[PDB]
Amino acid sequence: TSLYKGVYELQTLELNMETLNMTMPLSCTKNNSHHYIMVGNETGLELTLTNTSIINHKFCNLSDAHKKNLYDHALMSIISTFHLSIPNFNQYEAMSCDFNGGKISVQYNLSHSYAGDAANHCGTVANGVLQTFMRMAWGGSYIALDSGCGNWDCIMTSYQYLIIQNTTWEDHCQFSRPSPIGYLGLLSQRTRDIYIS
Amino acid sequence: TSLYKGVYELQTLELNMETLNMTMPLSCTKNNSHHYIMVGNETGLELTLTNTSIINHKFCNLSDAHKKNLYDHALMSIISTFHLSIPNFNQYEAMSCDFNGGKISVQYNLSHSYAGDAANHCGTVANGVLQTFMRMAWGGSYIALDSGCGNWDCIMTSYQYLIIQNTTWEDHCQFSRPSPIGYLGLLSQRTRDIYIS
Amino acid sequence: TSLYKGVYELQTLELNMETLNMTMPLSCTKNNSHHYIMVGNETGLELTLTNTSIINHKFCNLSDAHKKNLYDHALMSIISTFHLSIPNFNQYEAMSCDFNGGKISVQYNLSHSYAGDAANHCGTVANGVLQTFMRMAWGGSYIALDSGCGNWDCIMTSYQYLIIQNTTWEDHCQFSRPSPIGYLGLLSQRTRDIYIS
Amino acid sequence: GTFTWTLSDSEGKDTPGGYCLTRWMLIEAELKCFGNTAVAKCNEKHDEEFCDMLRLFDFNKQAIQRLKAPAQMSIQLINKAVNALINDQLIMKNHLRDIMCIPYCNYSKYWYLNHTTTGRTSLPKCWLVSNGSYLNETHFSDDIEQQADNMITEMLQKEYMERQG
Amino acid sequence: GTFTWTLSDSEGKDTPGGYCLTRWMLIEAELKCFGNTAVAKCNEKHDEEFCDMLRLFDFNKQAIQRLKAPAQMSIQLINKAVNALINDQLIMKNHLRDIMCIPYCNYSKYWYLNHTTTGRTSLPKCWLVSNGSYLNETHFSDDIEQQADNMITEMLQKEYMERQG
Amino acid sequence: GTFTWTLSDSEGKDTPGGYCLTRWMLIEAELKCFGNTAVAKCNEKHDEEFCDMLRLFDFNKQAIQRLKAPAQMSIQLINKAVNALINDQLIMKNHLRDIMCIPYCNYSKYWYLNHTTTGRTSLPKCWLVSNGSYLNETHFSDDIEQQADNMITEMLQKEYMERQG
Ligand SMILES: *[C@@H]1O[C@H](CO)[C@@H](O[C@@H]2O[C@H](CO)[C@@H](O[C@@H]3O[C@H](CO[C@H]4O[C@H](CO)[C@@H](O)[C@H](O)[C@@H]4O)[C@@H](O)[C@H](O[C@H]4O[C@H](CO)[C@@H](O)[C@H](O)[C@@H]4O)[C@@H]3O)[C@H](O)[C@H]2NC(C)=O)[C@H](O)[C@H]1NC(C)=O
Ligand SMILES: *[C@@H]1O[C@H](CO)[C@@H](O[C@@H]2O[C@H](CO)[C@@H](O[C@@H]3O[C@H](CO[C@H]4O[C@H](CO)[C@@H](O)[C@H](O)[C@@H]4O)[C@@H](O)[C@H](O[C@H]4O[C@H](CO)[C@@H](O)[C@H](O)[C@@H]4O)[C@@H]3O)[C@H](O)[C@H]2NC(C)=O)[C@H](O)[C@H]1NC(C)=O
Ligand SMILES: *[C@@H]1O[C@H](CO)[C@@H](O[C@@H]2O[C@H](CO)[C@@H](O[C@@H]3O[C@H](CO[C@H]4O[C@H](CO)[C@@H](O)[C@H](O)[C@@H]4O)[C@@H](O)[C@H](O[C@H]4O[C@H](CO)[C@@H](O)[C@H](O)[C@@H]4O)[C@@H]3O)[C@H](O)[C@H]2NC(C)=O)[C@H](O)[C@H]1NC(C)=O
Ligand SMILES: *[C@@H]1O[C@H](CO)[C@@H](O[C@@H]2O[C@H](CO)[C@@H](O[C@@H]3O[C@H](CO)[C@@H](O)[C@H](O)[C@@H]3O)[C@H](O)[C@H]2NC(C)=O)[C@H](O)[C@H]1NC(C)=O
Ligand SMILES: *[C@@H]1O[C@H](CO)[C@@H](O[C@@H]2O[C@H](CO)[C@@H](O[C@@H]3O[C@H](CO)[C@@H](O)[C@H](O)[C@@H]3O)[C@H](O)[C@H]2NC(C)=O)[C@H](O)[C@H]1NC(C)=O
Ligand SMILES: *[C@@H]1O[C@H](CO[C@@H]2O[C@@H](C)[C@@H](O)[C@@H](O)[C@@H]2O)[C@@H](O[C@@H]2O[C@H](CO)[C@@H](O)[C@H](O)[C@H]2NC(C)=O)[C@H](O)[C@H]1NC(C)=O
Ligand SMILES: *[C@@H]1O[C@H](CO[C@@H]2O[C@@H](C)[C@@H](O)[C@@H](O)[C@@H]2O)[C@@H](O[C@@H]2O[C@H](CO)[C@@H](O)[C@H](O)[C@H]2NC(C)=O)[C@H](O)[C@H]1NC(C)=O
Ligand SMILES: *[C@@H]1O[C@H](CO[C@@H]2O[C@@H](C)[C@@H](O)[C@@H](O)[C@@H]2O)[C@@H](O[C@@H]2O[C@H](CO)[C@@H](O)[C@H](O)[C@H]2NC(C)=O)[C@H](O)[C@H]1NC(C)=O
Ligand SMILES: *[C@@H]1O[C@H](CO)[C@@H](O[C@@H]2O[C@H](CO)[C@@H](O)[C@H](O)[C@H]2NC(C)=O)[C@H](O)[C@H]1NC(C)=O
Ligand SMILES: *[C@@H]1O[C@H](CO)[C@@H](O[C@@H]2O[C@H](CO)[C@@H](O)[C@H](O)[C@H]2NC(C)=O)[C@H](O)[C@H]1NC(C)=O
Ligand SMILES: *[C@@H]1O[C@H](CO)[C@@H](O[C@@H]2O[C@H](CO)[C@@H](O)[C@H](O)[C@H]2NC(C)=O)[C@H](O)[C@H]1NC(C)=O
Ligand SMILES: *[C@@H]1O[C@H](CO)[C@@H](O[C@@H]2O[C@H](CO)[C@@H](O)[C@H](O)[C@H]2NC(C)=O)[C@H](O)[C@H]1NC(C)=O
Ligand SMILES: *[C@@H]1O[C@H](CO)[C@@H](O[C@@H]2O[C@H](CO)[C@@H](O)[C@H](O)[C@H]2NC(C)=O)[C@H](O)[C@H]1NC(C)=O
Ligand SMILES: *[C@@H]1O[C@H](CO)[C@@H](O[C@@H]2O[C@H](CO)[C@@H](O)[C@H](O)[C@H]2NC(C)=O)[C@H](O)[C@H]1NC(C)=O
Ligand SMILES: *[C@@H]1O[C@H](CO)[C@@H](O[C@@H]2O[C@H](CO)[C@@H](O)[C@H](O)[C@H]2NC(C)=O)[C@H](O)[C@H]1NC(C)=O
Ligand SMILES: *[C@@H]1O[C@H](CO)[C@@H](O[C@@H]2O[C@H](CO)[C@@H](O)[C@H](O)[C@H]2NC(C)=O)[C@H](O)[C@H]1NC(C)=O
Ligand SMILES: *[C@@H]1O[C@H](CO)[C@@H](O[C@@H]2O[C@H](CO)[C@@H](O)[C@H](O)[C@H]2NC(C)=O)[C@H](O)[C@H]1NC(C)=O
Structure with a gap:
């Protein structure tokens, strides 16, 4: 390559973040419709954008799940980090869960990209949930939006639901290099966008 | 002016924060009894200290307002930032609201500067609400207190209510230069003074 | 002592943190079973690890205490800081209180070091409460654990209850130098380990 | 860009030795240009105060010129700018x-x-x-x-x- | 330890003039060693980006070699590492x-x-x-x-x- | 004030070359004075540890001498001092x-x-x-x-x- 000032060779370095799996979660993409968060070499979450309507009730039995604690605390912690990072999340009926003991089973209803709230306007529930999604899958999530860069409040997708389910570790990642940055960026939220009750 | 070391002229610079209106709110004063927070060049909040008793019920219908979302999210966000920054706010019956759809209508009852809580002692509800007020209107709010600098817990005013209402943009500001610092200082709260339930 | 490079004498300095009592709380130890947090030169909290079962009901009357405000706000603030810093505190029935007006009276039930939650496994309620305890009494708390350094999630003690009660100032501290660091470290929590409802 | 304090990657495509403050951001100043030698100092954090405003002015401009103005404040965006740019x-x-x-x-x-x-x-x-x-x-x-x-x-x-x- | 950016107190018990990145942390690099003169620069905070990864790699290693691996992630531990090591x-x-x-x-x-x-x-x-x-x-x-x-x-x-x- | 680390604006109205630690803040030391050349170093953030205590001692003193002592701790005040002065x-x-x-x-x-x-x-x-x-x-x-x-x-x-x- 190019020689700078007649004495320096430009050289590059690429870091392998795949060896950080034992201490921190790694986020990656696969094909837009699917993104993954892996922990260790055993399990993780599958984040999908799909027209599937898998949960058909309007409530999340969290307190019940906490009493029947049959779940991996690491996965619940990651999900909580995701949930609590959704700015201005007012539409609680849009979040439904079916833990059934140890499953994750979490569904966010963004139907028609406003989920019944008024109309598909900018700055709505879909925007709130999608911004967190885009950050959690920052390694690669840009493929999800065609126009969102020019106006951050008009992030909209066509998919009706954001589905979070637990899966096993598989070599799921492609189209990118697994990275903890999305997750780390969410942990250091600092400012929370919370409306008064 | 003065020449330093025989070679430097002291010079001054004054920044115009009035051109930051499109991206961040600007706080200013007017006549103690009134302070303002303006957004863009269209609207904002009028913060007043007055013996008016405008809301005559003891509740704030926030969940109802969130379902009937006829409000500017920017104003609700600013108000929330204010509310959640009141340290040790235990007296919930002191906060009353009447959104009536799209209005702000927020009243904080500091009557007799303790609002019925014991007596007008230092470190009470009036102090909590006023400290946040003093910071939100930091550009200029010092005119509100005659003795508070010598003992931060004895900030007291004579006015019974802190009223927050939405208004239109008008060139309201005088006695100071509009500045985002109060607001920015509140966003970076870092530590929250919250008692256990 | 040793002379470095032939010209410097190594010298030491020891700071007296006991003179910081008027503006910040100081934490110290005494005999493992007891630790203290002192404020000013008048009062403070006694933190104990004991098989005493002092509170025999499963609830904490906080809202009632807030209405009947007969308590030192400083002590309530310190306790709140402690409580809100317990990661993943799901077992609410484990926290019982009897303020009776102005007392602190706070009991955390870690019985059998899982408090009835499954079995005495790593990463449980005892671990959550003890990690906060260990930090609040960081000046000296290491005497509490024989093996915890090798695995932070397996911090366990044999004592059934963590008891927090208010006492008077006495020269309680021994085995260490009073220090605000534990408390300060808890105030700057930054990241909160909170599960979804 | 000789300024790590800015968001723009085109910041250095200007007078190589100076950074100018437009008349629009100043009160009755007309024009103020400071040498890059001094302005660049706040690339490092020195708890300088002055460059916190410069970072807000830089943000403000970038948020207007590169994005379609949303015309709705986007408080949720300024909140991130604050945490990234301001010395608390x-x-x-x-x-x-x-x-x-x-x-x-x-x-x-x-x-x-x-x-x-x-x-x-x-x-x-x-x-x-x-x-x-x-x-x-x-x-x-x-x-x-x-x-x-x-x-x-x-x-x-x-x-x-x-x-x- | 010549690096205040590391957690280990034994960091300096190595080639006095260099810090090496193991083959395991690199993609097809085999071995990369950087002089301590340059690596030590991020002892100071320069908003450097590169050393944020070095701090995570250092943490990761210390968390594996000094502790019994919990084999359960200990997300609650990484959370403290993040707040201590990462430039937000x-x-x-x-x-x-x-x-x-x-x-x-x-x-x-x-x-x-x-x-x-x-x-x-x-x-x-x-x-x-x-x-x-x-x-x-x-x-x-x-x-x-x-x-x-x-x-x-x-x-x-x-x-x-x-x-x- | 030659120390940007202090809150007082009168900090420099003392021995021009030194900063002294009173006997009252030390354990059996009687008197310790450090040159301003070294003390001033923590005007910059070097993750020094020692000056975090100096900032607390400076705060503590200012909070006592300039304000009527509230005699009630004012935990809500120390909380702001912590966020402003302490290296977390x-x-x-x-x-x-x-x-x-x-x-x-x-x-x-x-x-x-x-x-x-x-x-x-x-x-x-x-x-x-x-x-x-x-x-x-x-x-x-x-x-x-x-x-x-x-x-x-x-x-x-x-x-x-x-x-x-
Ligand atoms: C920083 O920015 C860059 C730019 O996008 C991102 O770049 C991606 O980097 C990842 C790896 O970290 C790339 O993933 C791999 O790309 C290979 C590209 O090979 C091409 O050419 C061969 C020729 O035979 C084709 O076969 C192939 O299809 C491509 O056209 C793929 O070959 C790799 O696939 C192999 O590995 C994956 C797992 O990693 C397996 O699932 C596959 O079966 C196969 O074994 C792999 O896809 C990615 O392509 C890069 N994209 C681009 C456009 O550069 C970085 O990810 C980003 N880093 C971060 C995290 O910010
Ligand atoms: C930093 O600290 C300084 C010190 O207080 C604060 O100073 C204030 O700065 C604001 C402007 O940013 C000043 O506001 C303006 O003051 C003018 C003073 O003029 C005097 O003399 C003329 C002579 O004819 C009189 O007419 C006038 O009444 C004064 O006695 C006013 O003339 C200005 O009024 C005009 O503009 C306002 C809108 O800005 C209009 O509403 C009026 O109708 C009129 O057109 C204006 O009031 C303020 O006076 C300053 N106070 C002092 C004591 O200096 C800074 O605000 C502060 N900065 C921050 C934000 O920290
Ligand atoms: C940093 O790390 C060091 C190492 O542990 C900690 O060290 C402790 O420091 C505290 C003081 O800050 C020590 O407390 C005092 O220790 C004295 C030790 O004296 C020994 O020798 C005499 C000989 O006659 C014996 O009588 C005595 O029992 C000891 O064997 C004690 O004498 C002191 O007791 C006196 O003061 C206390 C109150 O401070 C009174 O309650 C007693 O009645 C008596 O008057 C006192 O105990 C402690 O011993 C040190 N431990 C060690 C092993 O060094 C620092 O605390 C730590 N700093 C922090 C906060 O991080
Ligand atoms: C609200 O904020 C805007 C900044 O976003 C404030 O400043 C005004 O902004 C417009 C658009 O950039 C400027 O327009 C320009 O005018 C010059 C005139 O010579 C022209 O050559 C350019 O092509 C362009 O049209 C306008 O000058 C500027 N005005 C200023 C700084 O005075 C606006 O003033 C703020 N409004 C309120 C109520 O605070
Ligand atoms: C999950 O994380 C581990 C790191 O904790 C990833 O790397 C593998 O870690 C093991 C244990 O340190 C390495 O074992 C060593 O192999 C060499 C081979 O020459 C041997 O000499 C040593 O004595 C030791 O046995 C292993 O090499 C290392 N593999 C790498 C970096 O490729 C692991 O790959 C991660 N797994 C997943 C699914 O991501
Ligand atoms: C997922 O759905 C969106 C939105 O379509 C709505 O929901 C569907 C499940 C179905 O009930 C439709 O009748 C609803 O209208 C699909 O996106 C397209 O959106 C544009 C407007 O932005 C609309 O004009 C198109 O007709 C929609 N496409 C179709 C086939 O109707 C999106 O393509 C669906 N994705 C998948 C994988 O099915
Ligand atoms: C606003 O009220 C305060 C407090 O007065 C009380 O509330 C009034 C509405 C009325 O019901 C009074 O009878 C109540 O006592 C006024 O401040 C003064 O406070 C001092 C003690 O600090 C007291 O001795 C004075 O009598 C009060 N002033 C008056 C006229 O009673 C304050 O001035 C009122 N402000 C306005 C604009 O009306
Ligand atoms: C505090 O209790 C623990 C745990 O013992 C249980 O609770 C007691 C109050 C009593 O009801 C016991 O029968 C319960 O088993 C004591 O710690 C020991 O723990 C080991 C296992 O880790 C167990 O094998 C020992 O038998 C327990 N010790 C005794 C005397 O039973 C702890 O010592 C008690 N501490 C004090 C001060 O009483
Ligand atoms: C979530 O909790 C509700 C109760 O709060 C569960 O609904 C009850 O289910 C039982 C049968 O198991 C019925 O007899 C009750 O009449 C139901 N009550 C209500 C209000 O519907 C619900 O099944 C739980 N769901 C999940 C996914 O755990
Ligand atoms: C989500 O996690 C749970 C718990 O790890 C998985 O449930 C286990 O599945 C195996 C195989 O079917 C059973 O033998 C276990 O008894 C189940 N345990 C529990 C607590 O239910 C579940 O399969 C995972 N989800 C997915 C999609 O793999
Ligand atoms: C996801 O949310 C949408 C939007 O609220 C739900 O769609 C509504 O369904 C009812 C009953 O079929 C219709 O009367 C409404 O008109 C639909 N709303 C819109 C905007 O078309 C949808 O049922 C929810 N899905 C799940 C699985 O809960
Ligand atoms: C706040 O909500 C309460 C209900 O929780 C509203 O009060 C009810 O108003 C209807 C008439 O619209 C009456 O028939 C009910 O009897 C009232 N219930 C109670 C408990 O008072 C109240 O009006 C709402 N207020 C605002 C400002 O929105
Ligand atoms: C607070 O904001 C609301 C909404 O922007 C304002 O209400 C509007 O007022 C105009 C003029 O009276 C009406 O034509 C609109 O239909 C109203 N909209 C709604 C949603 O009610 C309200 O006037 C503002 N408050 C003040 C004091 O100006
Ligand atoms: C604001 O709060 C004050 C204080 O609680 C209320 O004043 C009380 O009103 C009742 C009924 O008139 C009296 O019996 C009490 O003695 C008053 N309290 C005190 C301390 O004098 C006031 O009504 C509230 N105002 C509004 C609009 O809610
Ligand atoms: C905590 O609050 C409960 C009520 O929510 C108190 O229990 C009541 O006590 C009265 C007597 O004072 C009885 O008549 C009621 O029947 C009790 N109700 C219930 C639900 O038990 C309880 O005593 C309070 N405890 C403390 C420590 O303050
Ligand atoms: C905890 O604090 C309370 C309030 O400071 C103490 O209660 C006081 O005790 C004295 C002596 O018995 C009584 O004269 C006061 O009337 C009590 N005040 C209240 C509000 O109850 C209590 O003693 C302290 N706890 C301990 C263990 O000392
Ligand atoms: C503290 O918590 C323990 C654990 O939940 C309680 O112990 C239980 O007591 C009941 C009734 O005696 C027994 O049937 C259970 O078997 C005990 N649990 C275990 C694991 O042995 C204890 O009573 C609680 N103490 C207080 C003061 O609330």
């Missing part, structure tokens, strides 16, 4: 000084030294206030003299090294 | 640049200058991306040239002072 | 080192080097502990030698420039 300890310290009756930064008026024959200037420092008004010039004598010595020292050291290496 | 303003700035359509750090590819006869290298800088791909080399010409001048300056100043004192 | 990464790192079985800062005992004929001293560094006790002197040999070289270097560079410019 400085705001809190000025707050503490205010409430502790200690002179503090107003975030409006700044002062700098301007060399009378070279046109070289210092980075600006915040003019302090106390009890509703500005502190008198005499109370800044020590600060001004030190700033003047710092500039003299830099000029001499620069000249020394140009001659030496 | 940099992550937020790269986020803002991304959403504001400004080239930003990928946290994968880095570049550095390597002197062709001495083997001395610069601390690495993050290679920027924009719209799904990497920026072309021409857009880094200014950054590379400045880094090259910084290294030249350091070599000359070092030589100057070795001769002078 | 250092506390968290010492916490992590403790729980990771790595020697860490006790925030009590500090050491410094004292030149035997000039009386000039270094800024103090925190003495480390591990498993209930203090680390032995031999384990600090590398740190002490480096600090000694840093002081020697500074003395020589100062002398060099006094002669040169």
